[PDB]
């Protein structure tokens, strides 16, 4: 897939910065990271907060934020960038995101690629996703596959 | 050690519970809860005449702790010393305790002020004043303790059986009343404290207007029931009114400390009356004739010169006297408490001032609009 | 209008002569001043239609306003 | 074996002014933090350790540092002359962990309570819910006062360990032989 001139940003992801809050121990953060049927599930409630850092600064164009069809796919996502400190759910709800995202149903499918405002993502070091709600309004949310499409800034 | 407690578990009000608690606290080597319990025990309504065994017990506690804060220990020591009632052995006991606890805490300060308080009764000056000086000179970097400053109050206020401690005493007693933020004192004790505060303020040479005395809760809150004459006196004094008949009424209302100084009081109130004049005319007519002072202060026109003389000398006011036309120019810098209606009036004056400034800023801007650009 | 910076210093007094305890930061007069080789940078970043250190009549009346 | 940043929470309240342990309850918690920090550092050489007091305010004397000697030195000269304030202490420790260097470190704090926590159960449970929300493995150890593992602490852990949560093991210390082996048998095996 992916638009011409871009690449999957998987090899540029630094595992030292990755950190997901409210995840069930049985459903690890790597499940959403990996392109398998394995999924990441929130453990406390629907809200989730996943921070991913990169080895080198990168520029994002589109995200593949997809989950299952049972309605537990995300629906409202606040994206913050270059966070100098770990993110708190209270502030994340309060804070103004770099980009707000109302994930329609079609995004959650396997062919769902969500374009991002490339203007605001030109010096991304670490990207934090605050999943505020899910489609089915369940007590928890599942993410089948999450990744980023973009290009390195060639540091 | 617990054997002494067991054999002495009697001889105490409600002895079984409290003494068994002491047993279990000692046998468990619990210290801070034990310190609090023994503090409450010596604070019970009783005489606690078992002075020897309790000093032995606190000896064991203080020897085994070697870390318990000296505050609780020295409070216990103060209570036991007040119990035993003998000067020289108490002095030696306080020296031993202060040698025992030499932490930078407010322990040596507490022992020193206890020494001074006990030594006020004998040798008022030659040992106590220098203890006060030492206490105040190395009393630093502990403002929030608020207990050691209370004891410094005890030292300085009980030092008031002198002449100089009539304005200094008032200042330090006020510093106490500020220091002990919560009242938590018996109504009779606070009544006596407000009584002596009023007496100090009236007789203080350096105290002239000094509000916040009437606004102090400790005084107004509990002097309105009895001895209201002192409250009326304070009202008249800070209101400037001579109030001749009522001021005399209180002059023989409390014959001691007021008959022997009535003249001074008159002097003071006369000066205060002058303040009222310079406070009742808001600079519209700053020139006041000697007739106004003579009638208001109920004095002959020959003494108004001396009255204004004294007022200027003491620093209250900074006017001048035109004797030829019998007037006094007034530019005085002694303010006062402001009587919320008076605060509203002053706010209205400020409203007038600010509206003038705004109107004329608008005028200047409109006129100079060509060049402001 | 006039609030570039405000400086406070903690003091050791309860609240006043006869009041409970507190901390009560005290205001201190604050100025803005630069040494040489730093005034030059400020001047260079400035030099818009602003400045004109010589105070002509129009700027003086503006100052009065 | 596991990357982790631990904010140990030492106690210097006036209720630490106890002789439940032979020299001093404070000294017992002192070598307790010493041995626990040694175990955590030697278990994983890149782990982080920091120090938080809880007397009348929550000083942050030592933050997340792989070094142990400096935290040990800061642990000395502690002067237990205060009163505990648990909720603010855990709040400060949690946000300190939020400021951790490496984001792969599993969040965990070590809290040494030796005084009855004066609080309300509602704030305890809401704080436990918040801490579980951030995936933090708080570890609470009761010392000193006899009301060991109060209902407050029990509810706090259980809500935080909701259905096999982080492992906020509510270990109990005897009022007497609070020896180091009794302080390491349960936690090193499982917090």
mmCIF file with all atom_site columns, N, CA, C and O in Angstrom, chain D residues 160-191:
data_model
loop_
_atom_site.group_PDB
_atom_site.id
_atom_site.type_symbol
_atom_site.label_atom_id
_atom_site.label_alt_id
_atom_site.label_comp_id
_atom_site.label_asym_id
_atom_site.label_entity_id
_atom_site.label_seq_id
_atom_site.pdbx_PDB_ins_code
_atom_site.Cartn_x
_atom_site.Cartn_y
_atom_site.Cartn_z
_atom_site.occupancy
_atom_site.B_iso_or_equiv
_atom_site.pdbx_formal_charge
_atom_site.auth_seq_id
_atom_site.auth_comp_id
_atom_site.auth_asym_id
_atom_site.auth_atom_id
_atom_site.pdbx_PDB_model_num
ATOM 1   N N  . UNK D 1 160 ? -6.333 -0.577  43.457 1.00 0.00 ? 160 UNK D N  1
ATOM 2   C CA . UNK D 1 160 ? -5.215 -0.451  42.533 1.00 0.00 ? 160 UNK D CA 1
ATOM 3   C C  . UNK D 1 160 ? -4.841 -1.802  41.934 1.00 0.00 ? 160 UNK D C  1
ATOM 4   O O  . UNK D 1 160 ? -4.470 -1.883  40.758 1.00 0.00 ? 160 UNK D O  1
ATOM 5   N N  . UNK D 1 161 ? -4.912 -2.869  42.723 1.00 0.00 ? 161 UNK D N  1
ATOM 6   C CA . UNK D 1 161 ? -4.782 -4.220  42.181 1.00 0.00 ? 161 UNK D CA 1
ATOM 7   C C  . UNK D 1 161 ? -6.142 -4.797  41.813 1.00 0.00 ? 161 UNK D C  1
ATOM 8   O O  . UNK D 1 161 ? -6.502 -5.894  42.231 1.00 0.00 ? 161 UNK D O  1
ATOM 9   N N  . UNK D 1 162 ? -6.913 -4.056  41.026 1.00 0.00 ? 162 UNK D N  1
ATOM 10  C CA . UNK D 1 162 ? -8.213 -4.541  40.617 1.00 0.00 ? 162 UNK D CA 1
ATOM 11  C C  . UNK D 1 162 ? -8.112 -5.759  39.723 1.00 0.00 ? 162 UNK D C  1
ATOM 12  O O  . UNK D 1 162 ? -7.673 -5.653  38.574 1.00 0.00 ? 162 UNK D O  1
ATOM 13  N N  . UNK D 1 163 ? -8.505 -6.922  40.246 1.00 0.00 ? 163 UNK D N  1
ATOM 14  C CA . UNK D 1 163 ? -8.473 -8.183  39.506 1.00 0.00 ? 163 UNK D CA 1
ATOM 15  C C  . UNK D 1 163 ? -7.055 -8.483  39.004 1.00 0.00 ? 163 UNK D C  1
ATOM 16  O O  . UNK D 1 163 ? -6.758 -8.445  37.809 1.00 0.00 ? 163 UNK D O  1
ATOM 17  N N  . UNK D 1 164 ? -6.181 -8.763  39.973 1.00 0.00 ? 164 UNK D N  1
ATOM 18  C CA . UNK D 1 164 ? -4.777 -9.071  39.713 1.00 0.00 ? 164 UNK D CA 1
ATOM 19  C C  . UNK D 1 164 ? -4.107 -7.905  38.980 1.00 0.00 ? 164 UNK D C  1
ATOM 20  O O  . UNK D 1 164 ? -3.696 -7.993  37.822 1.00 0.00 ? 164 UNK D O  1
ATOM 21  N N  . UNK D 1 165 ? -4.037 -6.790  39.696 1.00 0.00 ? 165 UNK D N  1
ATOM 22  C CA . UNK D 1 165 ? -3.438 -5.597  39.144 1.00 0.00 ? 165 UNK D CA 1
ATOM 23  C C  . UNK D 1 165 ? -1.926 -5.649  39.121 1.00 0.00 ? 165 UNK D C  1
ATOM 24  O O  . UNK D 1 165 ? -1.328 -6.688  38.823 1.00 0.00 ? 165 UNK D O  1
ATOM 25  N N  . UNK D 1 166 ? -1.297 -4.520  39.449 1.00 0.00 ? 166 UNK D N  1
ATOM 26  C CA . UNK D 1 166 ? 0.145  -4.385  39.276 1.00 0.00 ? 166 UNK D CA 1
ATOM 27  C C  . UNK D 1 166 ? 0.931  -5.303  40.202 1.00 0.00 ? 166 UNK D C  1
ATOM 28  O O  . UNK D 1 166 ? 2.034  -5.735  39.850 1.00 0.00 ? 166 UNK D O  1
ATOM 29  N N  . UNK D 1 167 ? 0.399  -5.611  41.377 1.00 0.00 ? 167 UNK D N  1
ATOM 30  C CA . UNK D 1 167 ? 1.231  -6.247  42.372 1.00 0.00 ? 167 UNK D CA 1
ATOM 31  C C  . UNK D 1 167 ? 1.605  -5.265  43.458 1.00 0.00 ? 167 UNK D C  1
ATOM 32  O O  . UNK D 1 167 ? 2.780  -5.084  43.782 1.00 0.00 ? 167 UNK D O  1
ATOM 33  N N  . UNK D 1 168 ? 0.611  -4.553  43.976 1.00 0.00 ? 168 UNK D N  1
ATOM 34  C CA . UNK D 1 168 ? 0.825  -3.663  45.108 1.00 0.00 ? 168 UNK D CA 1
ATOM 35  C C  . UNK D 1 168 ? 0.742  -4.497  46.383 1.00 0.00 ? 168 UNK D C  1
ATOM 36  O O  . UNK D 1 168 ? -0.193 -4.391  47.177 1.00 0.00 ? 168 UNK D O  1
ATOM 37  N N  . UNK D 1 169 ? 1.747  -5.345  46.590 1.00 0.00 ? 169 UNK D N  1
ATOM 38  C CA . UNK D 1 169 ? 1.683  -6.267  47.717 1.00 0.00 ? 169 UNK D CA 1
ATOM 39  C C  . UNK D 1 169 ? 1.716  -5.528  49.051 1.00 0.00 ? 169 UNK D C  1
ATOM 40  O O  . UNK D 1 169 ? 2.657  -4.785  49.345 1.00 0.00 ? 169 UNK D O  1
ATOM 41  N N  . UNK D 1 170 ? 0.663  -5.740  49.844 1.00 0.00 ? 170 UNK D N  1
ATOM 42  C CA . UNK D 1 170 ? 0.489  -5.150  51.171 1.00 0.00 ? 170 UNK D CA 1
ATOM 43  C C  . UNK D 1 170 ? 1.196  -6.005  52.221 1.00 0.00 ? 170 UNK D C  1
ATOM 44  O O  . UNK D 1 170 ? 0.581  -6.676  53.053 1.00 0.00 ? 170 UNK D O  1
ATOM 45  N N  . UNK D 1 171 ? 2.526  -5.971  52.178 1.00 0.00 ? 171 UNK D N  1
ATOM 46  C CA . UNK D 1 171 ? 3.291  -6.757  53.131 1.00 0.00 ? 171 UNK D CA 1
ATOM 47  C C  . UNK D 1 171 ? 3.139  -6.160  54.526 1.00 0.00 ? 171 UNK D C  1
ATOM 48  O O  . UNK D 1 171 ? 2.922  -4.953  54.696 1.00 0.00 ? 171 UNK D O  1
ATOM 49  N N  . UNK D 1 172 ? 3.220  -7.022  55.532 1.00 0.00 ? 172 UNK D N  1
ATOM 50  C CA . UNK D 1 172 ? 3.132  -6.624  56.927 1.00 0.00 ? 172 UNK D CA 1
ATOM 51  C C  . UNK D 1 172 ? 4.450  -6.915  57.625 1.00 0.00 ? 172 UNK D C  1
ATOM 52  O O  . UNK D 1 172 ? 5.049  -7.975  57.422 1.00 0.00 ? 172 UNK D O  1
ATOM 53  N N  . UNK D 1 173 ? 4.895  -5.975  58.449 1.00 0.00 ? 173 UNK D N  1
ATOM 54  C CA . UNK D 1 173 ? 6.109  -6.174  59.230 1.00 0.00 ? 173 UNK D CA 1
ATOM 55  C C  . UNK D 1 173 ? 5.706  -6.429  60.678 1.00 0.00 ? 173 UNK D C  1
ATOM 56  O O  . UNK D 1 173 ? 4.743  -5.823  61.171 1.00 0.00 ? 173 UNK D O  1
ATOM 57  N N  . UNK D 1 174 ? 6.362  -7.355  61.378 1.00 0.00 ? 174 UNK D N  1
ATOM 58  C CA . UNK D 1 174 ? 6.088  -7.519  62.798 1.00 0.00 ? 174 UNK D CA 1
ATOM 59  C C  . UNK D 1 174 ? 6.548  -6.281  63.571 1.00 0.00 ? 174 UNK D C  1
ATOM 60  O O  . UNK D 1 174 ? 7.538  -5.643  63.193 1.00 0.00 ? 174 UNK D O  1
ATOM 61  N N  . UNK D 1 175 ? 5.851  -5.933  64.647 1.00 0.00 ? 175 UNK D N  1
ATOM 62  C CA . UNK D 1 175 ? 6.318  -4.802  65.464 1.00 0.00 ? 175 UNK D CA 1
ATOM 63  C C  . UNK D 1 175 ? 7.666  -5.054  66.107 1.00 0.00 ? 175 UNK D C  1
ATOM 64  O O  . UNK D 1 175 ? 8.328  -4.097  66.524 1.00 0.00 ? 175 UNK D O  1
ATOM 65  N N  . UNK D 1 176 ? 8.096  -6.308  66.190 1.00 0.00 ? 176 UNK D N  1
ATOM 66  C CA . UNK D 1 176 ? 9.352  -6.650  66.805 1.00 0.00 ? 176 UNK D CA 1
ATOM 67  C C  . UNK D 1 176 ? 10.437 -6.918  65.785 1.00 0.00 ? 176 UNK D C  1
ATOM 68  O O  . UNK D 1 176 ? 11.069 -5.999  65.254 1.00 0.00 ? 176 UNK D O  1
ATOM 69  N N  . UNK D 1 177 ? 10.675 -8.195  65.488 1.00 0.00 ? 177 UNK D N  1
ATOM 70  C CA . UNK D 1 177 ? 11.806 -8.553  64.624 1.00 0.00 ? 177 UNK D CA 1
ATOM 71  C C  . UNK D 1 177 ? 11.603 -8.118  63.184 1.00 0.00 ? 177 UNK D C  1
ATOM 72  O O  . UNK D 1 177 ? 11.303 -8.938  62.311 1.00 0.00 ? 177 UNK D O  1
ATOM 73  N N  . UNK D 1 178 ? 11.768 -6.824  62.927 1.00 0.00 ? 178 UNK D N  1
ATOM 74  C CA . UNK D 1 178 ? 11.691 -6.290  61.568 1.00 0.00 ? 178 UNK D CA 1
ATOM 75  C C  . UNK D 1 178 ? 13.031 -6.427  60.852 1.00 0.00 ? 178 UNK D C  1
ATOM 76  O O  . UNK D 1 178 ? 13.562 -5.477  60.279 1.00 0.00 ? 178 UNK D O  1
ATOM 77  N N  . UNK D 1 179 ? 13.578 -7.637  60.878 1.00 0.00 ? 179 UNK D N  1
ATOM 78  C CA . UNK D 1 179 ? 14.897 -7.882  60.324 1.00 0.00 ? 179 UNK D CA 1
ATOM 79  C C  . UNK D 1 179 ? 14.864 -7.789  58.802 1.00 0.00 ? 179 UNK D C  1
ATOM 80  O O  . UNK D 1 179 ? 13.811 -7.891  58.167 1.00 0.00 ? 179 UNK D O  1
ATOM 81  N N  . UNK D 1 180 ? 16.051 -7.606  58.220 1.00 0.00 ? 180 UNK D N  1
ATOM 82  C CA . UNK D 1 180 ? 16.154 -7.391  56.780 1.00 0.00 ? 180 UNK D CA 1
ATOM 83  C C  . UNK D 1 180 ? 15.609 -8.577  55.997 1.00 0.00 ? 180 UNK D C  1
ATOM 84  O O  . UNK D 1 180 ? 14.932 -8.396  54.977 1.00 0.00 ? 180 UNK D O  1
ATOM 85  N N  . UNK D 1 181 ? 15.898 -9.800  56.448 1.00 0.00 ? 181 UNK D N  1
ATOM 86  C CA . UNK D 1 181 ? 15.393 -10.975 55.746 1.00 0.00 ? 181 UNK D CA 1
ATOM 87  C C  . UNK D 1 181 ? 13.872 -10.991 55.735 1.00 0.00 ? 181 UNK D C  1
ATOM 88  O O  . UNK D 1 181 ? 13.253 -11.369 54.734 1.00 0.00 ? 181 UNK D O  1
ATOM 89  N N  . UNK D 1 182 ? 13.249 -10.593 56.845 1.00 0.00 ? 182 UNK D N  1
ATOM 90  C CA . UNK D 1 182 ? 11.804 -10.415 56.850 1.00 0.00 ? 182 UNK D CA 1
ATOM 91  C C  . UNK D 1 182 ? 11.373 -9.271  55.946 1.00 0.00 ? 182 UNK D C  1
ATOM 92  O O  . UNK D 1 182 ? 10.217 -9.240  55.513 1.00 0.00 ? 182 UNK D O  1
ATOM 93  N N  . UNK D 1 183 ? 12.275 -8.338  55.654 1.00 0.00 ? 183 UNK D N  1
ATOM 94  C CA . UNK D 1 183 ? 11.971 -7.229  54.763 1.00 0.00 ? 183 UNK D CA 1
ATOM 95  C C  . UNK D 1 183 ? 12.260 -7.545  53.301 1.00 0.00 ? 183 UNK D C  1
ATOM 96  O O  . UNK D 1 183 ? 11.973 -6.707  52.442 1.00 0.00 ? 183 UNK D O  1
ATOM 97  N N  . UNK D 1 184 ? 12.841 -8.705  53.004 1.00 0.00 ? 184 UNK D N  1
ATOM 98  C CA . UNK D 1 184 ? 13.179 -9.073  51.632 1.00 0.00 ? 184 UNK D CA 1
ATOM 99  C C  . UNK D 1 184 ? 12.591 -10.407 51.201 1.00 0.00 ? 184 UNK D C  1
ATOM 100 O O  . UNK D 1 184 ? 12.654 -10.731 50.005 1.00 0.00 ? 184 UNK D O  1
ATOM 101 N N  . UNK D 1 185 ? 12.041 -11.203 52.119 1.00 0.00 ? 185 UNK D N  1
ATOM 102 C CA . UNK D 1 185 ? 11.519 -12.512 51.740 1.00 0.00 ? 185 UNK D CA 1
ATOM 103 C C  . UNK D 1 185 ? 10.376 -12.386 50.740 1.00 0.00 ? 185 UNK D C  1
ATOM 104 O O  . UNK D 1 185 ? 10.388 -13.022 49.681 1.00 0.00 ? 185 UNK D O  1
ATOM 105 N N  . UNK D 1 186 ? 9.383  -11.567 51.061 1.00 0.00 ? 186 UNK D N  1
ATOM 106 C CA . UNK D 1 186 ? 8.216  -11.362 50.210 1.00 0.00 ? 186 UNK D CA 1
ATOM 107 C C  . UNK D 1 186 ? 8.467  -10.417 49.034 1.00 0.00 ? 186 UNK D C  1
ATOM 108 O O  . UNK D 1 186 ? 8.068  -10.741 47.908 1.00 0.00 ? 186 UNK D O  1
ATOM 109 N N  . UNK D 1 187 ? 9.098  -9.249  49.227 1.00 0.00 ? 187 UNK D N  1
ATOM 110 C CA . UNK D 1 187 ? 9.151  -8.288  48.110 1.00 0.00 ? 187 UNK D CA 1
ATOM 111 C C  . UNK D 1 187 ? 10.043 -8.711  46.960 1.00 0.00 ? 187 UNK D C  1
ATOM 112 O O  . UNK D 1 187 ? 9.631  -8.601  45.801 1.00 0.00 ? 187 UNK D O  1
ATOM 113 N N  . UNK D 1 188 ? 11.265 -9.168  47.232 1.00 0.00 ? 188 UNK D N  1
ATOM 114 C CA . UNK D 1 188 ? 12.157 -9.529  46.135 1.00 0.00 ? 188 UNK D CA 1
ATOM 115 C C  . UNK D 1 188 ? 11.587 -10.705 45.359 1.00 0.00 ? 188 UNK D C  1
ATOM 116 O O  . UNK D 1 188 ? 11.655 -10.748 44.125 1.00 0.00 ? 188 UNK D O  1
ATOM 117 N N  . UNK D 1 189 ? 11.011 -11.677 46.067 1.00 0.00 ? 189 UNK D N  1
ATOM 118 C CA . UNK D 1 189 ? 10.297 -12.751 45.388 1.00 0.00 ? 189 UNK D CA 1
ATOM 119 C C  . UNK D 1 189 ? 9.106  -12.195 44.615 1.00 0.00 ? 189 UNK D C  1
ATOM 120 O O  . UNK D 1 189 ? 8.918  -12.506 43.433 1.00 0.00 ? 189 UNK D O  1
ATOM 121 N N  . UNK D 1 190 ? 8.298  -11.354 45.268 1.00 0.00 ? 190 UNK D N  1
ATOM 122 C CA . UNK D 1 190 ? 7.200  -10.663 44.588 1.00 0.00 ? 190 UNK D CA 1
ATOM 123 C C  . UNK D 1 190 ? 6.836  -9.423  45.408 1.00 0.00 ? 190 UNK D C  1
ATOM 124 O O  . UNK D 1 190 ? 6.100  -9.531  46.392 1.00 0.00 ? 190 UNK D O  1
ATOM 125 N N  . UNK D 1 191 ? 7.345  -8.266  44.979 1.00 0.00 ? 191 UNK D N  1
ATOM 126 C CA . UNK D 1 191 ? 7.072  -6.955  45.560 1.00 0.00 ? 191 UNK D CA 1
ATOM 127 C C  . UNK D 1 191 ? 6.432  -6.868  46.936 1.00 0.00 ? 191 UNK D C  1
ATOM 128 O O  . UNK D 1 191 ? 6.877  -6.115  47.799 1.00 0.00 ? 191 UNK D O  1
#
